[PDB]
């Protein structure tokens, strides 16, 4: 009876880490001094196994199960991807990867996630109203001097400065789906990574110049990290949405419940908590 509900990796809306060798997870404690709420998500760490998960999305879920009298069942997208649509077996049938499959699939019965709304997902799932507000901006090693997108290393792509994002996410189709950006797109699809950890990594280290991402993880992670800087202003606005089947059962009492939260403070109180609290020391 209870839901099963998909999520993925993302600081600082889900973190993933090991639980302790009895299998419970560490007690620690927010910036306000409550206790970080824990839930136990089943994922790849290969091998499957239980880990502990946090964070921005997992407060909210908590939040959703309350107010909507639901119990549930949490695990980590298997491909470690958010989805995009392609062909499948070297044919012409096309399925969607990431947690859009699992959703549609049946493996999953909710996306609680950092999921940007757009419209070609829209077509094949619905999305609660927005439970977040954001866009799309570049993260760069401080000392790198791009203006934004519309930079001319970034707009005449060249193997002296390499860009990319990660490989089956929303970003991806951004680019793939403009001719305009064309010239951009070829050059990403030779460098994206498998997820935006290891694309964070490779700024810092120096192996990767322009990591183009959702900004509220990277003005999160630069805010963390004094090496590494955002470009500014945002090129593009999306939100982020809770993920369901259409003709769902949940979809009217799950956008309630985030109406509320934007209304009465449990939002602006998450970000206090996990994403502007303090300086950067990481």
Not at 123 to 146: A, D, H, M, N
Not at 160 to 184: C, G, N, P
Not at 259 to 268: D, R, T, V
């Amino acid at each position: 009876t209870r839901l099963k509900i998909v999520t993925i990796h993302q600081e600082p809306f889900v973190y993933v880490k090991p639980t302790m060798s009895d299998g419970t997870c560490k007690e620690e404690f927010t910036v306000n001094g409550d206790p970080v709420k824990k839930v136990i998500c089943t994922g790849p760490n290969r091998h499957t196994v239980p880990q502990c998960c946090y964070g921005f999305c997992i407060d909210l879920l908590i939040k959703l199960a309350r107010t909507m009298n639901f119990t549930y069942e949490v695990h980590l997208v298997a491909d470690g991807k958010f989805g995009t649509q392609e062909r499948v077996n070297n044919s012409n049938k096309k399925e969607w990867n990431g947690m859009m499959g699992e959703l549609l699939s049946g493996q999953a019965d909710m996306i609680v996630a950092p999921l940007t709304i757009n419209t070609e997902r829209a077509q094949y799932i619905e999305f609660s109203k927005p439970f977040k507000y954001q866009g799309l901006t570049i993260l760069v090693k401080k000392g790198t001097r791009i203006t934004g997108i519309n930079d001319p290393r970034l707009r005449n792509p060249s193997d002296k400065f390499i860009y990319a994002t990660v490989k089956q996410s929303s970003v991806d189709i951004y680019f793939r789906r403009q001719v305009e950006l064309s010239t951009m797109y070829r050059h990403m699809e030779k460098h994206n990574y498998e997820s935006a950890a290891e694309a964070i990594q490779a700024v810092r280290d120096n192996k990767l110049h322009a990591f183009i991402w959702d900004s509220a993880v990277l003005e999160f992670e630069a805010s963390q990290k004094c090496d590494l800087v955002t470009t500014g202003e945002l090129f593009f606005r999306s939100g982020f949405g809770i993920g369901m089947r259409k003709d769902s059962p949940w979809k009217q009492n799950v956008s309630l419940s985030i109406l509320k939260s934007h209304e009465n403070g449990f939002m602006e109180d998450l970000d206090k908590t996990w994403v502007r609290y303090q300086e950067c020391d990481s």
